[PDB]
Design a protein around this ligand. Structure first.
Ligand SMILES: C[C@@H](Oc1cc(-c2cnn(C)c2)cc2nscc12)[C@H]1CNC(=O)O1
Length: 276
């Protein structure tokens, strides 16, 4: 898969930031393609670390190897005043911010969105990729009923003869989204992404509230070790809280993979639609 370079002269950027990803500040832009001016999201590597350039280009490369309706598509790379990763713009933005601003969104609509995420994740697992940053801030809404997975900055392609990535450097990690085996032994698998998916589901049903609010990483570790978990969000269906708890199975061997998770979501979604 060859890198696609874009022409800086055909790209216009707005100064208002959409937010930041693992390896860059993201701004809304416009890419002049033939006669159509296409709205885009541009991740700009400021780098206020020489390895950071390699991390952004690896993220672009991971995106180019993926092709799924629930995974953000990249348009190309632009090497100009900074290294830039140009991707398709998800107009409604991150799920957590969207739900904080739209408390009227139904439980049925949330189920549809997290089910779409589980489908993209099942595809990722089958392809031998680990996401390593699965959280509501990285689920982007194209429309109110169409979510896509984003930010592949920490993602890794596993070799066909391995089932986990061993981190060599303990960097700035989103510990509240990480499974115990990640925190304790630096081992990241698709099952570790399932744990993160459970936290994502809690964030979605809590309308973008922060998980484990005010707690230190050590307090979260202590809580999980003794078999305790975040509470059931107000109005969250029992089946969805039970699925969160299954994603939060402590022992990685006994935790379900995304095929089991997507099946439970698909079944519950069809029960919700068909009950009324
Ligand atoms: C900054 C944010 O990325 C994006 C954010 C928004 C966005 C934000 N607000 N609004 C309305 C829209 C749209 C996007 N389309 S493609 C990437 C983004 C994080 C999440 N993933 C990532 O790589 O960085």
């Amino acid at each position: 898969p060859k890198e696609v370079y874009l022409d800086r002269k055909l790209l216009t950027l707005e100064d208002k930031e959409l937010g930041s990803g693992n390896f860059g500040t993201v701004k809304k832009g416009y890419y002049q393609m033939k006669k159509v001016v296409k709205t885009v999201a541009v991740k700009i590597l400021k780098n206020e670390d020489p390895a950071l350039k390699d991390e952004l280009l690896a993220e672009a490369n991971v995106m180019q190897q993926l092709d799924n309706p629930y995974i953000v598509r990249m348009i190309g790379i632009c090497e100009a005043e900074s290294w830039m990763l140009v991707m398709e713009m998800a107009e409604l933005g991150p799920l957590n911010k969207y739900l904080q601003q739209n408390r009227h969104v139904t439980d049925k609509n949330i189920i549809e969105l997290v089910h779409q995420v589980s489908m993209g994740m099942k595809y990722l697992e089958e392809s031998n990729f680990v996401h390593r940053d699965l959280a509501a801030r990285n689920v982007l809404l194209v429309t109110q009923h169409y979510a896509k997975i984003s930010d592949f900055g920490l993602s890794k392609a596993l070799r066909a003869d391995e089932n986990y990535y061993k981190a060599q450097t303990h960097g700035k990690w989103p510990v509240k989204w990480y499974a115990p085996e990640c925190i304790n032994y630096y081992k990241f698998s698709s099952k570790s992404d399932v744990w993160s998916f459970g936290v994502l589901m809690w964030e979605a049903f809590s309308y973008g509230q922060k998980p484990y609010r005010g707690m230190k990483g050590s307090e979260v570790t202590a809580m999980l070790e003794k078999g305790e978990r975040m509470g059931c969000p107000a109005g969250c269906p029992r089946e969805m809280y039970d699925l969160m708890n299954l994603c939060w199975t402590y022992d990685v061997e006994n935790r379900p993979g995304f095929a089991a998770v997507e099946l439970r979501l698909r079944n519950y979604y069809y029960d919700v639609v068909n009950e009324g």
